[PDB]
Structures are given as structure tokens and as C-alpha cells.
Short mmCIF file of C-alpha atoms in Angstrom, two decimals:
data_model
loop_
_atom_site.label_atom_id
_atom_site.label_comp_id
_atom_site.label_asym_id
_atom_site.label_seq_id
_atom_site.Cartn_x
_atom_site.Cartn_y
_atom_site.Cartn_z
CA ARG A 1 -7.93 16.74 5.81
CA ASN A 2 -5.08 19.42 7.02
CA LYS A 3 -2.61 17.20 9.23
CA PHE A 4 -2.55 14.40 5.80
CA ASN A 5 -4.47 11.21 6.62
CA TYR A 6 -3.44 8.93 9.63
CA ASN A 7 -2.15 5.36 9.69
CA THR A 8 -4.01 2.64 11.75
CA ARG A 9 -1.82 -0.08 14.30
CA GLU A 10 -2.95 -2.94 15.85
CA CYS A 11 -0.60 -4.31 19.01
CA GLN A 12 -2.02 -7.06 21.58
CA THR A 13 0.07 -8.68 24.79
CA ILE A 14 0.01 -12.56 25.62
CA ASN A 15 -3.34 -13.51 27.95
CA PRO A 16 -2.75 -16.48 29.98
CA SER A 17 -5.56 -18.60 31.25
CA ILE A 18 -7.14 -18.90 34.64
CA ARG A 19 -7.57 -22.87 36.48
CA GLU A 20 -9.11 -24.40 39.14
CA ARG A 21 -6.95 -27.02 40.75
CA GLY A 22 -7.05 -27.73 44.32
CA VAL A 23 -4.52 -31.08 45.50
CA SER A 24 -4.71 -32.33 49.03
CA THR A 25 -2.79 -33.58 51.65
CA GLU A 26 -3.35 -36.49 53.87
CA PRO A 27 -1.92 -36.67 57.99
CA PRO A 28 0.14 -39.83 57.74
CA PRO A 29 -0.56 -42.48 59.49
CA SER A 30 1.07 -44.16 62.67
CA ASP A 31 1.30 -47.37 64.71
CA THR A 32 0.25 -48.49 68.66
CA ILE A 33 2.31 -51.26 69.94
CA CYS A 34 2.75 -53.09 72.97
CA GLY A 35 4.80 -55.12 74.74
CA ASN A 36 5.71 -57.26 78.33
CA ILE A 37 9.14 -56.87 80.10
CA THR A 38 11.44 -59.72 79.87
CA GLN A 39 13.82 -61.45 82.65
CA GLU B 1 -13.52 -4.54 -22.56
CA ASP B 2 -10.39 -4.63 -22.09
CA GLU B 3 -9.66 -0.98 -23.57
CA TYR B 4 -11.57 0.38 -20.62
CA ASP B 5 -10.50 -1.73 -18.05
CA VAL B 6 -7.03 -1.57 -17.98
CA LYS B 7 -8.08 2.76 -18.15
CA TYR B 8 -9.89 1.94 -15.46
CA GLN B 9 -7.54 0.52 -12.99
CA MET B 10 -4.70 3.12 -14.02
CA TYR B 11 -7.17 4.72 -12.59
CA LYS B 12 -7.39 3.55 -9.42
CA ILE B 13 -4.04 4.10 -8.86
CA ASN B 14 -4.75 7.26 -9.83
CA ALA B 15 -7.71 8.00 -7.03
CA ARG B 16 -4.89 6.01 -5.42
CA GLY B 17 -2.57 8.28 -4.77
CA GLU B 18 -4.78 11.59 -4.84
CA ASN B 19 -6.38 10.70 -1.71
CA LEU B 20 -2.44 9.60 -0.60
CA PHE B 21 -1.39 12.78 -1.39
CA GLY B 22 -4.80 15.24 0.03
CA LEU B 23 -5.68 16.66 -3.49
CA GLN B 24 -8.24 17.39 -5.29
CA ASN B 25 -9.90 13.65 -6.86
CA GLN B 26 -10.03 14.25 -10.79
CA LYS B 27 -13.78 12.77 -12.34
CA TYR B 28 -14.03 11.49 -15.43
CA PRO B 29 -16.92 10.98 -17.30
CA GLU B 30 -16.00 9.33 -20.70
CA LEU B 31 -15.24 6.47 -19.22
CA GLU B 32 -18.66 5.94 -17.67
CA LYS B 33 -20.05 7.16 -20.99
CA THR B 34 -17.66 3.98 -22.38
CA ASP B 35 -19.87 1.77 -19.63
CA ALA B 36 -22.83 2.42 -20.05
CA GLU B 37 -22.89 2.17 -23.60
CA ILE B 38 -20.68 -0.83 -24.11
CA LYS B 39 -22.95 -2.16 -20.64
CA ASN B 40 -25.97 -2.11 -22.80
CA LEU B 41 -24.53 -3.17 -26.47
CA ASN B 42 -22.67 -6.08 -24.06
CA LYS B 43 -26.02 -7.28 -22.14
CA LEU B 44 -27.93 -7.30 -25.40
CA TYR B 45 -24.60 -8.79 -27.70
CA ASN B 46 -24.78 -11.98 -24.64
CA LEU B 47 -28.08 -12.92 -25.01
CA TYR B 48 -28.06 -13.26 -28.63
#
């Protein structure tokens, strides 16, 4: 009107996506033997 | 038709510049009179 007409603008940022992923470890295995003593 | 059409587009860029500079938009009635008369004329002649 008195200040001349303004000018529209646009800006947007980069929005990464949210993912839900779940993984597992495991208890390592073990061995259990029995032996006798030789002569 | 072509004549008042190019007149109309000239008037359009006129209004563009006038609104850019914020002046009072100049208004013209003879183009409207032309448009109405040739509108009825062209509708009847196209139907014919």
C-alpha cells in the first residue's frame, strides 16, 4: 500500500525418516567334558 | 477479435506494470463495449 508490495519466499530443511529396528546378541556356547588321568 | 485480443494483452501488461509501481490502475470502457457487441455478434454468427 505504502511500502511496496512484499514478495513471498519458501525454504524447508531436510527431514530424515524415523525407523524402528531391533537386533539381538546371544550368549556364546560352552562345552563340558570329563576325562580321566592316565598312567 | 484478434485486434481487441492483442489490445487486451497490452492492457494486461499495462496493469502489471501499474500494479508493480503502485499507481492507480487506468481503466478503459471502449474495450468492454467492443467485447459485448462482438460477443453477441459472434455468438449469432457462429450459430448461423
